[PDB]
Amino acid sequence: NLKITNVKTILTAPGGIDLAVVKIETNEPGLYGLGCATFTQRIFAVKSAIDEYMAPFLVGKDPTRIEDIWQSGVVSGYWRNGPIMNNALSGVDMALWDIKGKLAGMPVYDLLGGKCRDGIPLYCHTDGGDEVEVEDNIRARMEEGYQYVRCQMGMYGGAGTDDLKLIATQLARAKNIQPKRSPRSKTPGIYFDPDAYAKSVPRLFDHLRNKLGFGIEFIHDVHERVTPVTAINLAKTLEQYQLFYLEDPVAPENIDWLKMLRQQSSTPISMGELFVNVNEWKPLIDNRLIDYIRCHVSTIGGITPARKLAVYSELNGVRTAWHGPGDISPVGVCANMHLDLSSPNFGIQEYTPMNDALRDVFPGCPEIDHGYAYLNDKPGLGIDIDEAKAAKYPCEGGIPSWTMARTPDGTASRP
Amino acid sequence: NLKITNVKTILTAPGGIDLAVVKIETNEPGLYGLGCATFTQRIFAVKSAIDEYMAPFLVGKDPTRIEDIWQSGVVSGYWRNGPIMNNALSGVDMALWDIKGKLAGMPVYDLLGGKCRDGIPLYCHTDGGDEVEVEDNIRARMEEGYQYVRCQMGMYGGAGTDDLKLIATQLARAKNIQPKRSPRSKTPGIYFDPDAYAKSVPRLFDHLRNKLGFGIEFIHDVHERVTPVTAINLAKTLEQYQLFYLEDPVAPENIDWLKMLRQQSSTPISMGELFVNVNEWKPLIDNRLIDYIRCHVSTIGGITPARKLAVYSELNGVRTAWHGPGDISPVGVCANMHLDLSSPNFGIQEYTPMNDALRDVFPGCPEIDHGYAYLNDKPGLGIDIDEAKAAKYPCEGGIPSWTMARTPDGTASRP
Ligand SMILES: [Cl-]
Ligand SMILES: [Mg+2]
Ligand SMILES: [Mg+2]
């Protein structure tokens, strides 16, 4: 007669980025589950969604009924399909998977069908103010054993970032990108020039291919920064550089434009870190408009819907590339990886390296060894949280600044 | 030098249903705006989204720049397109429209282009345990001057409701619908039989058209309760009864099925009270798969996005029917109606009659006279809130019961 007894939210920032973790307790002594609910920009609203709504929904129920709980949970507020709602559901769903693995004495990847590969290949982020600094940073990552890298010159749209809420790191604006002149007064924002950015990208990859060759795999993230036809043209101009993928050429609001892109370009495309709705990803995958699906697993509602998405992708020849930024807890990192190891159609795993504090707060972080991640074989997600240590890193709260992105004339843009 | 000085949430339940209202104060003495943020099932998370995120985003800004504030606010948390996020934005957006009207000395409908009609026709809800009870209820509403009515026998799926969080009224289960026998043990939920429900609807309308004739307009709400092909067959069998519309024959997750429905049936269709994402409504409107769009204005982000939706619908010959349940504040009722008065493609206004406490807490409620609503000509939304009186009706909070809908075998179903 196993029952959920308690559900709680833990808010912690050991890597300098606000995280939300759900812990689900049961009436079996010592048996609990952990899940990721990290929507970093709205952590307090996520906490409210869990504590005020998911907790009374769950206490008393048999945690082994993961699918029933997910299906009933998703419709429990009637309205649904949003990032706050989905993250609250995810924390619950991953915790239940964690509990199921612990009961079975099996890692989640074994519950899901077992290992389809011997390690998880990773990509990491490289940046710089000019092409030489990017090149230097790639060399350093290659020395560490990375065989795949994302290359940005000036973060997103060439703008860099001063906002530590984004990745806990300041990144330089592109040094030599010359923006258009703005009007005589400016509304506050982080200014960028989408056209100057777009033209800089082929020049960057020309330099990088010249210096580093074609063995190393390259990723570039457009991050919805340009008009769709500009993104199409960029995809075409980048064909010669043979990117592993070109990421987020359009906003989710503009997914129809991928119909045109895919008639003209053979540069591999990834989309979807922003997706929260089946009506965003289903038309893309059904029509083969992408080669990699990029969802943030917690933001689509956890392991249960991510595995459905992985299967839907697999049957259409689309591969997975789950979102792996700084704004994901080590629990969510483990969840991505259990999916990765058990999916036939795994593509790549984006990885943001952790500091000592994250490894200390979350015992059981995956082993990173020469560009591959190696999950432990402990039951469930193989991850724990030290609640006392978590409390040493309280969340900063507040609002980000980087999301106020303005084009030269002052237009508020999708960031 | 006009600036926003304070943004706050008011939670009140004068009609027995939890409401969320946003009040935006400015540095001009006595000038403020009110907006609806009512997502009733998640009011505390909406409150968190406003108080922790919208408030610091807005203080100091010029409230006259409604579009800039909307466009920048919607992407401020990066992830977007969800019911909690959108309601927080709506509260702000409607309050800014209210402020703009007050500054202009004109109602919002006048800022939007003026009256397109002389009054707003309404439909109200009628229910009953059997056909004769529904008939009697319709007669009573026709005597009050309603010329359009929604007709349900047992609320949604024939199940009725005992949950006061839904519409603050207990409604009888359909008396004569015989469900399939369930398994020998049952998981808790509100049980219904989709097939017994579906067969009962044509029988209801056969009775109602015989007794009441064809002058009176009838609406029926399927409320996502049946399989898509069952919905298609229902639409076909109801053609002879000439419904004003058949509402929500499919879930948002199943919108593709409307392609098949519209090849076979000429029953008018409405969809969309559940919509939160452009990728849900845009394919429907682009392909003329519905005749009326049903969005809950606050849940799509306020007046700014609702006006865009109304225009997009107008150009495709689709008409508006904004959601008008019990779970919308009188501020939201006013916002619906200002859109209604100024839209060339207005279709109908669903209306849930208010009690004395709602009228007392919210001075300026629209005048209801013989089946039409008559907005006052006061500036902005023409509505106010008495905060001291609102405080006499604290919110109940908690989670609803009705959203746990199960079919005879125990399957958790979209409610
Ligand atoms: Cl949301
Ligand atoms: Mg990205
Ligand atoms: Mg409805």
PDB file of C-alpha atoms and ligand atoms in Angstrom, chain A residues 123 125 150 156 221-223 247-248 273 294 323 350, chain B residues 78, ligand 2:
ATOM      1  CA  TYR A 123      28.934  19.350 -26.839  1.00  0.00           C
ATOM      2  CA  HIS A 125      29.822  26.155 -25.495  1.00  0.00           C
ATOM      3  CA  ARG A 150      28.902  25.316 -30.175  1.00  0.00           C
ATOM      4  CA  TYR A 156      23.299  35.675 -29.122  1.00  0.00           C
ATOM      5  CA  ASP A 221      22.666  28.910 -32.329  1.00  0.00           C
ATOM      6  CA  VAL A 222      20.681  31.614 -34.178  1.00  0.00           C
ATOM      7  CA  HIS A 223      18.526  31.958 -31.035  1.00  0.00           C
ATOM      8  CA  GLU A 247      19.867  25.920 -34.010  1.00  0.00           C
ATOM      9  CA  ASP A 248      16.633  27.884 -33.612  1.00  0.00           C
ATOM     10  CA  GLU A 273      14.242  24.569 -26.419  1.00  0.00           C
ATOM     11  CA  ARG A 294      15.772  20.453 -28.597  1.00  0.00           C
ATOM     12  CA  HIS A 323      18.383  21.347 -23.890  1.00  0.00           C
ATOM     13  CA  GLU A 350      24.503  19.766 -24.827  1.00  0.00           C
TER      14      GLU A 350
ATOM     15  CA  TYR B  78      12.294  33.756 -22.274  1.00  0.00           C
TER      16      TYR B  78
HETATM   17 MG    MG C   2      19.746  27.345 -27.857  1.00  0.00          MG
END
